[PDB]
Design a protein around this ligand. Structure first.
Ligand SMILES: NS(=O)(=O)c1ccc(NC(=S)OCCc2ccsc2)cc1
Ligand SMILES: [Zn+2]
Length: 258
């Protein structure tokens, strides 16, 4: 009886095995754009992905992860609210069964069709595992997806999903360039939060871009053909793998733009 996104194992149940689910700095949150304040103390954000080295794509039963070789200082996030350098380790998405839902963060209560999470760990802690014992261990760059024009840079992801349909399947996935998943603008909102799945650890500086990317209906329909189950088990489509917004508690969301 493992956590998931169903009626008997989804977000309202997670707190029994992960009591931090009811913590002081849980994610995602609704971003109330009128309450968020421009912060002149934010430095410029730097997303340096030119030497990113993807390795593999994996269906972990909750989403799919595109994994990167993080053994060298290569694809890194710095600046903005961050102190020092954060290294890309993986990205993944959350998405809906219908285009009207799927994002984790919301913007003035609006849900996007999906949300991309580029996950980075603070290199001062040596590795990801030690980073998730720290309040500033991780930085997740979140990007909303809306349905419209196709995102050409996403197609290589979409085209490999048939090989990883079920939980536990992986495929080689080298030479994928995550630059092709970014919008034009780096304007963002930021706040301190958590992982949005178990173990829900409160280690994350969230950086959520304001400008969504557009993906086509056909691209997101291929996400919805993935399975939460493993091979040979009864089909349960991998859809609605998002946690809803959590209480903001004693936090302020800061904007990078005036
Ligand atoms: N949705 S989220 O971005 O908050 C988020 C990010 C990471 C995690 N946890 C983990 S354990 O990611 C592990 C990624 C990894 C490890 C080996 S290579 C890929 C859970 C939720
Ligand atoms: Zn995520």
């Amino acid at each position: 009886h493992h956590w998931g996104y169903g009626k008997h194992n989804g977000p309202e149940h997670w707190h029994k095995d992960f009591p931090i689910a009811k913590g002081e700095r849980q994610s995602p949150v609704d971003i109330d754009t009128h309450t968020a304040k421009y912060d002149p103390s934010l430095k410029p954000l730097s997303v340096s992905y030119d030497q990113a080295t993807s390795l593999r794509i994996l269906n972990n039963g909750h989403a799919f992860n595109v994994e990167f070789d993080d053994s060298q200082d290569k694809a890194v996030l710095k600046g903005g609210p961050l102190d020092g350098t954060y290294r890309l380790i993986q990205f993944h998405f959350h998405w809906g069964s219908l285009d009207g839902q799927g994002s984790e963060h919301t913007v003035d209560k609006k849900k996007y069709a999906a949300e991309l999470h580029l996950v980075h760990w603070n290199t001062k802690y040596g590795d990801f595992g030690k980073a998730v014992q720290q309040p500033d261990g991780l930085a997740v760059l979140g990007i909303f997806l809306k349905v419209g024009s196709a995102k050409p840079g996403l197609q290589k992801v979409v085209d490999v999903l048939d090989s990883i349909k079920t939980k536990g399947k992986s495929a080689d996935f080298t030479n994928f360039d995550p630059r092709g998943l970014l919008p034009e603008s780096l304007d963002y909102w930021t706040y301190p939060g958590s992982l949005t799945t178990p173990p829900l650890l409160e280690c994350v500086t969230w950086i959520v871009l304001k400008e969504p990317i557009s993906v086509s209906s056909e691209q997101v329909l291929k996400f919805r053909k993935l399975n939460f189950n493993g091979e040979g088990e009864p089909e349960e489509l991998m859809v609605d793998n998002w946690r809803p917004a959590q209480p903001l508690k004693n936090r302020q969301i800061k904007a990078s733009f005036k």
